[PDB]
Design an enzyme around this catalytic site. Structure first.
Site, mmCIF file in Angstrom:
data_model
loop_
_atom_site.group_PDB
_atom_site.id
_atom_site.type_symbol
_atom_site.label_atom_id
_atom_site.label_comp_id
_atom_site.label_asym_id
_atom_site.label_seq_id
_atom_site.Cartn_x
_atom_site.Cartn_y
_atom_site.Cartn_z
ATOM 1 N N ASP A 66 5.653 18.737 -29.854
ATOM 2 C CA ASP A 66 4.522 18.959 -30.732
ATOM 3 C C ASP A 66 4.732 19.885 -31.928
ATOM 4 O O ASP A 66 4.717 21.137 -31.820
ATOM 5 C CB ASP A 66 3.346 19.340 -29.935
ATOM 6 C CG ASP A 66 1.893 19.474 -30.990
ATOM 7 O OD1 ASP A 66 1.942 18.904 -31.991
ATOM 8 O OD2 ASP A 66 0.919 20.045 -30.261
ATOM 9 N N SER A 121 2.224 16.503 -50.281
ATOM 10 C CA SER A 121 2.575 15.058 -50.794
ATOM 11 C C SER A 121 2.414 14.711 -52.297
ATOM 12 O O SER A 121 1.270 15.409 -52.651
ATOM 13 C CB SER A 121 2.169 13.915 -49.729
ATOM 14 O OG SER A 121 2.625 12.889 -50.414
HETATM 15 C C1 LIG Z 1 -6.701 23.903 -39.092
HETATM 16 C C2 LIG Z 1 -7.601 23.201 -38.626
HETATM 17 C C3 LIG Z 1 -8.632 22.208 -37.849
HETATM 18 N N1 LIG Z 1 -8.234 21.999 -36.364
HETATM 19 C C4 LIG Z 1 -9.217 22.229 -35.582
HETATM 20 C C5 LIG Z 1 -7.762 20.400 -36.421
HETATM 21 C C6 LIG Z 1 -6.107 20.400 -35.896
HETATM 22 N N2 LIG Z 1 -5.799 19.986 -34.810
HETATM 23 C C7 LIG Z 1 -4.561 20.180 -34.841
HETATM 24 C C8 LIG Z 1 -3.501 19.691 -33.713
HETATM 25 O O1 LIG Z 1 -4.362 20.239 -32.538
HETATM 26 C C9 LIG Z 1 -3.377 18.198 -33.477
HETATM 27 C C10 LIG Z 1 -2.508 17.822 -32.303
HETATM 28 N N3 LIG Z 1 -1.228 18.622 -32.388
HETATM 29 C C11 LIG Z 1 -1.332 19.995 -32.522
HETATM 30 C C12 LIG Z 1 -2.312 20.446 -33.639
HETATM 31 C C13 LIG Z 1 -4.040 20.664 -36.054
HETATM 32 S S1 LIG Z 1 -5.216 21.082 -37.174
#
Ligand SMILES: C#CCN(C)Cc1nc(C2(O)CCNCC2)cs1
Length: 330
Positions: free
Chosen positions: A35, A199
């Site tokens: 990941d 991007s």
């Molecule tokens: C920053 C921001 C908002 N976040 C709560 C939302 C996000 N969720 C992720 C992950 O958990 C998705 C699954 N792989 C690992 C990363 C990154 S950003």
């Protein structure tokens, strides 16, 4: 040193990919979800609440002669989809595709949320984002890549995900036979702890390319491609019958449709996502409504270049002093 390991889709939709990882002495092999969007290596273990384990292979530190409790350390993580896990920490020897790290923090789960329990194919996660996101307290721990970096021939790893097929994670080298044309490298911001890049724009099918900056993260741990609502609306408008459904939780489309490709920009270069990659099949068994692989990031707070985008490319995660990201067609 180098490492090379095959990564395999967990189901017929490429919902996630698992990669075998050797932990402890003698080796205990677990299939982990690599990941690039998180920074904890955690595993189902002999310490995981029994009612929360259903088919997973567990790590048993008591059976490893090189396992050592990291006294007092705990961890707790929650991911973008609402899933979570927590527990305590061991250090142990960890090997990926021939590449070995000694004294790696192995976070042992005492608790996991239902979505992890229900996924019998995934025995844990191996985080490959920047170590500043690691959740171990009171002493933050380094990722597998961070620990291995000094020993690697080159401070890089590459992600080569397959479409409905196995792919490869390499460490310490760039396989010049694994892609076509050249690799286009682009700047990375580490300010949020992610492989965050910008991007240069997009196109829908054979449409004209729209130059526009889209900041997002390269995240192998996310299944779909999440982009601003404007971009996503422009894509699905080219599919007859496609619509956003609040009951389903995103864009769905008629299973009879032929999906257009989606192109994203990397500097002056272009990566083309074939239409078939964007099809995630019936929303429920037998349904004539299919779930879309491109979805809005509006309720997330960040754009995510997940597997749908990444599997269309050979991707270089360059962990040099100034990190960069490279994309090549393949
Ligand atoms: C920053 C921001 C908002 N976040 C709560 C939302 C996000 N969720 C992720 C992950 O958990 C998705 C699954 N792989 C690992 C990363 C990154 S950003």
């Amino acid at each position: 040193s180098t490492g090379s390991a095959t990564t395999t889709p967990i189901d017929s939709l490429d919902d996630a990919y698992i990669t075998p990882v050797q932990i402890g002495t003698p080796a205990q092999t677990l299939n982990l979800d690599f990941d690039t969007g998180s920074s904890d290596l955690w595993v189902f273990s002999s310490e995981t609440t029994a009612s929360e384990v259903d088919g997973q292979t567990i790590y048993t530190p008591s059976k490893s002669t090189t396992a050592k409790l990291l006294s007092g350390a705990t961890w707790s993580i929650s991911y973008g989809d609402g899933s979570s896990s927590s527990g305590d920490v061991y250090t142990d020897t960890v090997s990926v595709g021939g590449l070995t790290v000694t004294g790696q923090a192995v976070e042992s789960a005492k608790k996991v949320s239902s979505s992890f329990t229900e996924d019998s194919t995934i025995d844990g996660l191996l985080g490959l984002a920047f170590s500043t996101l690691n959740t171990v307290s009171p002493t933050q721990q380094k990722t597998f890549f961070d620990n291995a970096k000094a020993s690697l021939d080159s401070p890089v790893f590459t992600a080569d995900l397959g479409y409905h097929a196995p792919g490869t994670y390499n460490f310490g080298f760039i396989d010049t036979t694994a892609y076509t044309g050249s690799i286009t490298y682009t700047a990375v911001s580490t300010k949020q702890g992610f492989w965050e890049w910008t991007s240069t724009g997009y196109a829908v099918g054979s449409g004209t390319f729209k130059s526009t900056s889209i900041d997002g993260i390269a995240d192998t741990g996310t299944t779909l491609l999440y982009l601003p609502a404007t971009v996503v609306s422009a894509y699905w408008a080219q599919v007859s019958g496609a619509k956003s459904s609040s009951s389903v939780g995103g864009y769905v489309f008629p299973c009879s449709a032929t999906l257009p490709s989606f192109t994203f920009g990397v500097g002056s270069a272009r990566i083309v996502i074939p239409g078939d990659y964007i099809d995630f099949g019936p929303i429920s068994t037998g349904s004539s409504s299919c779930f879309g692989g491109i979805q809005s990031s509006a309720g997330i707070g960040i754009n995510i270049f997940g597997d749908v985008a990444l599997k269309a490319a050979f991707v270089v995660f360059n962990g040099a002093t100034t990190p960069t990201l490279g994309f090549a067609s393949k």
